[PDB]
Symmetry: D2
Subunit: 141 residues, 4 copies
């Protein structure tokens, strides 16, 4: 009962992130939604809705391919999916090389840097916010 591939990516994310919470206390599914609302194209919105499904849920790149998602979309999701064998800097460098992933990752950083949603702030947060700021600047050069 799906009309468009953007609707499918939503239903996949809502199901996959069901039961997860972000560090602010809210349902995690609203993070890819808030990133998707910052996007400008349907391709960016699809990747934004799924950008944390491979890392955090049972969704795999293989599953997305078998569900009909195009090669450039899945590769764009993989460009914003960190591998353990790489540093965070090498991950952001790999994100910038992808036209769709670069834009989605920028909006992902913006959402993660939105401290207006948080209850407090600790020293562990500012070290994480700092590398977000460095990655945010790198992706805008």
């Amino acid at each position: 009962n799906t009309s468009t591939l953007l609707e499918k990516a939503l239903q996949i994310a809502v199901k996959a992130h069901s039961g997860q919470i972000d560090k602010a206390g809210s349902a995690y599914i609203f993070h890819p939604i808030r990133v998707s609302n910052r996007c400008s194209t349907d391709d960016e919105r699809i990747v934004a809705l799924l950008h944390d499904t491979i890392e955090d849920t049972e969704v795999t790149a293989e599953y997305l391919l078998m569900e009909g998602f195009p090669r450039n979309i899945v590769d764009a999701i993989l460009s914003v999916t960190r591998n353990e064998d790489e540093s965070y800097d090498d991950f952001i460098k790999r994100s910038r090389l992808n036209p769709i992933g670069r834009q989605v990752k920028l909006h992902d950083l913006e959402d993660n840097m939105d401290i207006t949603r948080l209850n407090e702030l600790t020293e562990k947060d500012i070290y994480r916010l700092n590398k977000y700021i460095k990655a945010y600047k790198y992706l805008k050069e």
Copy 2:
């Protein structure tokens, strides 16, 4: 996860299922309409009503079903304030929406999304009449 945060996730899953496969005038999935309206809201109470504001027309989603799912009476009343009654005229419908503090705000963001012509392929004369009606209602909901 708090009760309001749980209801907000619950409200999303109820909207996704109810609007599954539905399309709007442009042809895109209708679910993104409540989501775009929600993104304009400021509080979680408003976000919940925004996500469910067009689900009463669905057969599975009723007022008692939402009460059964844990949504409090004030939230459900807000959803009913932005749900047009059977024989109710548009002018009478906007008047009823302003009486509800949450529904009034949600209806404003609903009008903003409906006035967004960046998603339309072409504008006709019928669209002008419809957009003029949204402008009048938008202005009415912003007064004191």
Copy 3:
């Protein structure tokens, strides 16, 4: 009247903050502009454009009254203008009492919590940002 007073408020702010900068080096004039962009009414936008003119520049309250800004607008600006002998805690409590000042202050805290423009984030910012979060929550309480 309101469309012209909004423009006048912009021109008063531009002239008053001219050449001032924030901690990131960006032009400070855009802080009231970005706060005014988050507002929903013309009264809020006017107060937001002028909310740091008394404290940071040579604009006075009598000056704004002389230019035609109504009493409620000037009072709202004063509700978000910290006094000398007033602590930050009492300042936030006083800004919540004014309907327009409360809303503009909320958007002011949102702009001050925007770290997308800072070059880096240190530990001294923890105190400032947590203070802003606490003040943000107090203003949102109903």
Copy 4:
């Protein structure tokens, strides 16, 4: 001068050049480049948005902007969204798409011009120009 950054100078130039001008909604025109600039993502886009309509002002010219310190690629971007005297609108939109910064600014320009939430009413005379905005908006979206 008494200006900090090129962005601030661009603001002051737009403020002066549009001073007293009014838009279709009856508001001060200066807030149009500001609202276009609020949609932009980089400082280069914001500078061009703030100045995207200053060339009509007799004081503001390409030479003036170069004199003030604005880089040539910024000035060329402003000229990419400045329509020529005998140029057709379609040819103007095609020319603005070739410029990376200008394309983005022209999209945000079109979004603001299509924002009918600021309008007090709509007539059928607005149909043609709104359909031109929609057509040009889609044409700039075909890039990706």
